[PDB]
């Protein structure tokens, strides 16, 4: 039972066109690196969206109480968000973002993890726009065109989907992380290697011992940022990424994805699941939490 399926623009419009039962709520989960000086909210409101889109605020729909970035939202924050956005349980949520499988996977995954029955990750809005799929180019003054709903996650899959620090640390402390898991870090190789800084000032780069660099971009088409198609394409991409970054993905091991903050970790997590890699979890705390909770002792550099 996939937490969300990728959906191509064509499959999406097919889905929309064919849908007789379920509301299809595209979910713009656009979130930008602050470095980009873009405004995801303004972009949602004022840049073309997939018709009937809600905006999924990656930032707001997170554990903002956590000292760690992009921490999975609490059930309440999530439900309230969904409610606020008028998301109904029955909605087919089709998540996209303006970047290209950047925050949308995180979002699709969040929706999925929070047990939303039907969640698609549009793969992706870039291609959707490139190929002129239906855009609501109207400027809106709402992050949702839908009346507030009473959305309540009946089930969630954090346990199956999110590696907590405790487990991450134990796995690493026990030196069993690499043994028991394919542990991939979606951050740049440079950040993984500690050769390049974390986008955070309080956090040195480097990696969790036992993890491997799988920079999320390696798993997306370089220009369109689409996930390669399931099957040969994603496998070719995945194996190439694994080759390029001298990584192992043991099909017998479950997988942990992490990154700096847990957002791009879902990008690769999604790519891995797309590639049919089973039991991929996101170390949501990711590198940031890792560093903050573990200290410099638990920071591996290069490929250590």
UniProtKB/Swiss-Prot annotation:
EC number(s) stated in the UniProt entry for this protein: 2.8.1.1
GO cellular component, as recorded: cytoplasm; mitochondrion
Region (Disordered): 191-222
Residues bearing PTM Phosphoserine: 201, 264
Enzyme class: transferase
GO biological processes: tRNA wobble position uridine thiolation; tRNA wobble uridine modification
Entry keywords, A to Z: Cytoplasm, Mitochondrion, Phosphoprotein, Repeat, Transferase
Further remark: Present with 5770 molecules/cell in log phase SD medium.
Domain notes: Contains two rhodanese domains with different primary structures but with near identical secondary structure conformations suggesting a common evolutionary origin. Only the C-terminal rhodanese domain contains the catalytic cysteine residue.
Free-text function comment from the UniProt entry: Sulfur transferase that accepts persulfite from NFS1 and transfers it to UBA4 in the pathway for 2-thiolation of the wobble uridine base of tRNAs. Stimulates sulfur transfer by NFS1. Involved in metabolism of sterol esters in a tRNA thiolation pathway-independent manner.
Listed name of the protein: Thiosulfate sulfurtransferase TUM1
Species per Swiss-Prot/TrEMBL record: Saccharomyces cerevisiae (strain ATCC 204508 / S288c) (Baker's yeast)
Lineage of source species: Eukaryota, Fungi, Dikarya, Ascomycota, Saccharomycotina
């Amino acid at each position: 039972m996939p937490l969300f399926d990728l959906i191509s623009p064509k499959a999406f419009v097919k889905l929309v066109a064919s849908e007789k039962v379920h509301r299809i709520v595209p979910v713009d989960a656009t979130w930008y690196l602050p470095s980009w000086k873009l405004d995801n909210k303004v972009d949602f409101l004022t840049k073309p969206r997939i018709p009937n889109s809600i905006f999924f605020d990656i930032d707001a729909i997170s554990d903002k109480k956590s000292p760690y970035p992009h921490m999975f939202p609490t059930k309440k924050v999530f439900d309230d968000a969904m409610s606020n956005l008028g998301v109904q349980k029955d909605d087919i949520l089709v998540v996209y973002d303006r970047v290209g499988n950047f925050s949308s996977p995180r979002c699709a995954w969040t929706l999925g993890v929070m047990g939303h029955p039907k969640v698609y990750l549009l793969n992706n809005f870039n291609q959707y726009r490139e190929f002129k799929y239906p855009l609501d180019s109207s400027k809106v003054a709402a992050f949702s065109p839908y009346p507030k709903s009473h959305y309540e996650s009946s089930e969630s899959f954090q346990d199956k989907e999110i590696v907590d620090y405790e487990e991450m640390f134990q796995l690493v402390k026990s030196g069993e992380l690499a043994k028991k898991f394919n542990a991939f870090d979606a951050r740049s190789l440079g950040r993984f290697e500690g050769t390049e800084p974390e986008p955070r000032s309080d956090i040195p780069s480097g990696h969790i011992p036992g993890t491997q660099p799988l920079p999320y971009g390696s798993l997306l088409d370089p220009e369109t940022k689409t996930y390669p198609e399931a099957g040969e394409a994603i496998h070719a991409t995945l194996e190439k990424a694994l080759k390029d970054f001298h990584c192992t993905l043991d099909p017998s091991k479950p997988t942990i994805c992490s990154c700096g903050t847990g957002v791009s970790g879902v990008i690769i997590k999604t790519a891995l699941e797309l590639a049919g890699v089973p039991n991929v979890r996101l170390y949501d705390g990711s590198w940031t939490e890792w560093v903050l909770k573990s200290g410099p002792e638990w920071i591996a550099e290069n490929r250590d």
